[PDB]
């Protein structure tokens, strides 16, 4: 069982560091249950995000075999391109051997430049993995180096250390109550049907079913632009001169929490999770269509609130409030 620690970097992002090569040469890498590569910057690109990131060279790893297979993903922000390598990865004490992976020709954008992390560890399904690169998580399994085919994520709240993703167990120490189990609906992303939105009550949105990714690596919970819209209404947030979608500190002790029921189970949100405060809403419009529909992204908004496994063996989610 190996766990990975991960930074909460401003409740925004969550990142830890993994080696590779030999000897290993470090990295910090969002996990990142909404895509499947791994990839890291390297010496064979001249973006400014690679100037100003760590970059992987190959020629100091004696474990190191290329291949020459080319890489390319667009990310909802943020791009890259690079060729694929094998080497030895580190990760939450696994040494996880023979381990195929995107060295970085190109990392175009302003995103991956103000980024605080290098690059990103993918932990979806091998179905999105751009060229067909072997997910971390699956290697490891391919591998016999976790003996249960699953793992569970914890992101703490208010900036504070202590999440981690926790592969090849569940720990129940990070959660109370049973863990209540969801088909993925489309193996793929970690993808499941959404039930309803309600909030005292009444559907405010997704009312006969929608769907929805769980997804480490997005900060918000965003929805298509139009039912957001709804919400945002809903619960007094309107859009300023800097874009920003602010909303009054005072409704974190008024408002009603936000409740989704996933698989006839129901999962609130309060007013403290759905209102960032330092106050703007958790809420953010994003389409993202797909050939089952607009996809819902449950982030760390949602993540946060509920102990979440990733459980390949029989491809389900299971959640369960944090402690
Ligand atoms: C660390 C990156 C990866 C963060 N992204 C999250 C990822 O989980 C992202 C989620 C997503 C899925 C499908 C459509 C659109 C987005 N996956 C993603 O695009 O996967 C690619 C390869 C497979 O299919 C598409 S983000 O959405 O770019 C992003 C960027 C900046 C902010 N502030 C918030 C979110």
Known sequence: ?????????????????????????????????????????????????????????????????????????????????????????????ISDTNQIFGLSETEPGSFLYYAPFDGILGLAYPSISASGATPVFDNLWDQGLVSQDLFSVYLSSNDDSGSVVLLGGIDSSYYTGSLNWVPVSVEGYWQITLDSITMDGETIACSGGCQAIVDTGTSLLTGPTSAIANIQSDIGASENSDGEMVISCSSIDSLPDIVFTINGVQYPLSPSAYILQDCTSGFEGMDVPTSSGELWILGDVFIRQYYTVFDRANNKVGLAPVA
């Open 1 to 93: 069982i190996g766990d990975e620690p991960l930074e909460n970097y401003l409740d925004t992002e969550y990142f830890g560091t993994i080696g590779i090569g030999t000897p290993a040469q470090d990295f910090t890498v969002i996990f990142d249950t909404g895509s499947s590569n791994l990839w890291v910057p390297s010496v064979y690109c001249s973006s400014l995000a690679c100037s100003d990131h760590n970059q992987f060279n190959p020629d100091d790893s004696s474990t190191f075999e290329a291949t020459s297979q080319e890489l390319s993903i667009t990310y909802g922000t943020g791009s890259m391109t690079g060729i694929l390598g094998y080497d030895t990865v580190q990760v939450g004490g």
